[PDB]
Design a protein around this ligand. Structure first.
Ligand SMILES: *[C@@H]1O[C@H](CO[C@@H]2O[C@@H](C)[C@@H](O)[C@@H](O)[C@@H]2O)[C@@H](O[C@@H]2O[C@H](CO)[C@@H](O[C@@H]3O[C@H](CO[C@H]4O[C@H](CO)[C@@H](O)[C@H](O)[C@@H]4O)[C@@H](O)[C@H](O[C@H]4O[C@H](CO)[C@@H](O)[C@H](O)[C@@H]4O)[C@@H]3O)[C@H](O)[C@H]2NC(C)=O)[C@H](O)[C@H]1NC(C)=O
Ligand SMILES: *[C@@H]1O[C@H](CO)[C@@H](O)[C@H](O)[C@H]1NC(C)=O
Length: 199
C-alpha cells in the first residue's frame, strides 16, 4: 500500500507560529489513510531535548511540540513516516515584528508633545539595539528626547502580540508642522514607522 501524507501540505512557504501564543508550536503530520515516525531538524535526528517533545497518535499521525520557543529554534523540521518512506518538511520561521505606536497630541505643562513608543513582539534576537531615524531630520536636536527602555534578555524567549514590550520612546516637544513626517525605529534587523501628520 502506497504511503502518503495528508498533512502538512507540500509547500516551500515559510511557516510561523501564531504570535498571540508564541511560546510553543505544535507541528503535526498525518497519513492519508490508516506506522512509525521519525523527526529531523535539517536532517539530524531529534528524547534528549526537553524542549522538543514527540508524541504519536492512538499511529496515523505524529506531533512535535517545541516549548520555550526562541529565535534560534527556526529551521527545517521534517517528519518521515514508515510502516519508500514519505517525508514532509515544515519551514518553521520565527519573525520579529516592530511596531511604532503614538500617544497622539498630549499637553505637558501647557506645551503639546507627541510620544512615540518602539514596541516589539514575536521572537527577538538581541542583535541590534532600537535605533530611531527620520528622513531629512536630525533626531539629536533639542526638540527630541530619546529614552531607552532597558528590558530583560528577550532572545531566550518570545513576546506575545497581546503583551508587547516597549524598547524605546521618542518624545517630540512643542509640536509644529515642521515635525511632520515618518519616524522609524529599527530593531534586530527589522523596522517599523509611524507618520506624524497634524492634518
Ligand atoms: C537549518 O536550515 C534552515 C534553512 O536554511 C536555509 O536553506 C538552506 C537550503 C540553506 O540555503 C541555508 O543557507 C538557508 O538559510 C536554517 O533556517 C534559516 O535561517 C536563516 C538565518 O537565521 C533565516 O533567515 C532569517 O529569517 C528571519 C525570519 O523571517 C520571518 O520573519 C520576517 C520578519 O522578522 C519576515 O519578513 C519573513 O517573511 C519571515 O516570516 C528573517 O527575519 C531574517 O531577515 C533578517 O536577517 C537577514 C540576514 O541577517 C537580513 O538580510 C534581513 O534584512 C533581516 O534583517 C532572515 O531572513 C531563515 O528564514 C531560516 N529558514 C527557515 C527557518 O526555513 C537554519 O538556520 C538551519 N539550522 C538549524 C539548526 O535549524
Ligand atoms: C517649548 O516651549 C516652552 C514655552 O515657550 C519652553 O519653555 C520650552 O523650553 C520649549 N521646549 C523646547 C524643547 O524648546
Amino acid at each position: 500500500p502506497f504511503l502518503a501524507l495528508s498533512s502538512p501540505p507540500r509547500t516551500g512557504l515559510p511557516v510561523s507560529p501564531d504570535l498571540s501564543q508564541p511560546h510553543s508550536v505544535t507541528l503535526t503530520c498525518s497519513a492519508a489513510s490508516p506506522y512509525q515516525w521519525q523527526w529531523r531538524r535539517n536532517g539530524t535526528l531529534l528524547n534528549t531535548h526537553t524542549r522538543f517533545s514527540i508524541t504519536p497518535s492512538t499511529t496515523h499521525s505524529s506531533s512535535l511540540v517545541i516549548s520555550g520557543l526562541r529565535y534560534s529554534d527556526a529551521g527545517d523540521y521534517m517528519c518521515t513516516v514508515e510502516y519508500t518512506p514519505v517525508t514532509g518538511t515544515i519551514h518553521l520561521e520565527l519573525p520579529l515584528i516592530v511596531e511604532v505606536d503614538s500617544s497622539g497630541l498630549v499637553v505637558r505643562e501647557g506645551s503639546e508633545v507627541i510620544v512615540l513608543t518602539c514596541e516589539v513582539y514575536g521572537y527577538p534576537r538581541d542583535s541590534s539595539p532600537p535605533m530611531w531615524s527620520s528622513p531629512g531630520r536630525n533626531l539629536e536636536s533639542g526638540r527630541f528626547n530619546i529614552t531607552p527602555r532597558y528590558t530583560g534578555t528577550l532572545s531566550n524567549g518570545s513576546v506575545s502580540s497581546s503583551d508587547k514590550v516597549a524598547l524605546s520612546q521618542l518624545t517630540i516637544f512643542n509640536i509644529t508642522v515642521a515635525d511632520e513626517g515618518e519616524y522609524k525605529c529599527s530593531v534586530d534587523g527589522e523596522s517599523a514607522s509611524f507618520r506624524v501628520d497634524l492634518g
